[PDB]
Amino acid sequence: GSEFDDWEIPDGQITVGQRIGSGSFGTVYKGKWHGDVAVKMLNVTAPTPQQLQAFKNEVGVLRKTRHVNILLFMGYSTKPQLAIVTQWCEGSSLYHHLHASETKFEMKKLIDIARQTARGMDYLHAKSIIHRDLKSNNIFLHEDNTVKIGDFGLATEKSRSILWMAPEVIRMNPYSFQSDVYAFGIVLYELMTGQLPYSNINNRDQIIEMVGRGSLSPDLSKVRSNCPKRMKRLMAECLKKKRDERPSFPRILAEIEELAREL
């Protein structure tokens, strides 16, 4: 029975702190409410009655999409600008661990992260939400070791980073549940290899079309030796160039769940 007005965090209750970086539609800062929060300042200066109502509509979606493996929407703030407030993940991002700290995860941990990410993506798809922007950069590690997917919000506003782009997207509308599945395949690649795909190609433009046409795909030889065979097989499916040949997330999760029992 709550309404949009009630999800505003009263002015002054959030102290905004260290700037973290850019996310979809805005800038992410660390903050303090009663506890740690993340605050994403939206890039909108003076919102028209139509843009405010759209913000209301998206917020309405965020309020009802809830799962242990996606960020919790905690409210929005109005001054100085519209902002989305969420819980803070002390473990930062998967990207930061894999590619910036070069943190060493053991195989069991890699697989647990893949499993939690698949659970999260499965829930979003079950709610008919297309993420469009899945990458290790917006997969977060909570202090309690849970995976929290982020950047799934403002989906409709979206329908108005090339490494995770399915070829049909990378050459072109083109976004689908199946393109989400591909980006997840790249995240599996990141996890199972410890590196970004195409690390041997220095020019984007070479990558953009070769992957687009289909003459370039991730080098699977870079996969760790203790990576389960099933996991390798699943990754290859999610990365199918023909989008209709990719598995869906109920299937992906089932495959990772069972594959995880064997351990």
Q: How many residues bind Cl ion (CB under 5 A)?
A: 5
- The reply to whether 257 sits near a copy of itself by the rule CB under 8 A is no
Of the pair 94, 186, the CB lying nearest a copy of itself is at 94
Task: Kindly state whether residue 33 participates in binding Cl ion, applying the rule CB under 5 A.
Answer: no
Task: Write out the binding residues for a copy of itself, residues 41-100 only, by CB under 8 A.
Answer: 90-92, 96, 100
Number of helical H runs and strand E runs in the chain:
9, 7
Among candidate residues 133, 151, 205, 244, the one labeled active-site is: 133
Q: Are 164 and 209 in contact (CB under 8 A)?
A: no
Dist. CA 219–CA 197, nearest whole Å: 7
Strands (E), the chain: 15-23, 26-32, 36-42, 73-77, 83-87, 139-141, 147-149
Nearest distance in Å: CB 12, Cl ion: 19
Is 133 a catalytic site residue?
yes
Q: Is 111 annotated as a binding residue?
A: no
74 forms part of the interface with Cl ion (CB under 5 A): yes
Site for a copy of itself contains 146 (CB under 8 A) = no
Q: In the complex, what is the shortest distance from the CB of residue 46 to Cl ion, in angstroms, rounded to a whole number?
A: 20
CB of 32 to Cl ion, least distance (A): 16
Handedness of CA 197, 201, 202, 208 (dihedral sign): negative
**Letter for the amino acid at 19?**
R
Could you say which of 2, 6, 12, 18 contacts a copy of itself (CB under 8 A)?
18
| Cβ contacts of 31 within 8 Å, gap of 6 or more | 14, 15, 16, 17, 37, 38, 39, 85, 88
- In the chain, the N- to C-terminal Cα span, in Å, equals 45
Residues lying near Cl ion in the complex (CB under 5 A) are found at: 4, 56, 59-60, 74
Active site residues: 133
Summarize the annotated binding site for ATP as residue ranges: 20-28, 40
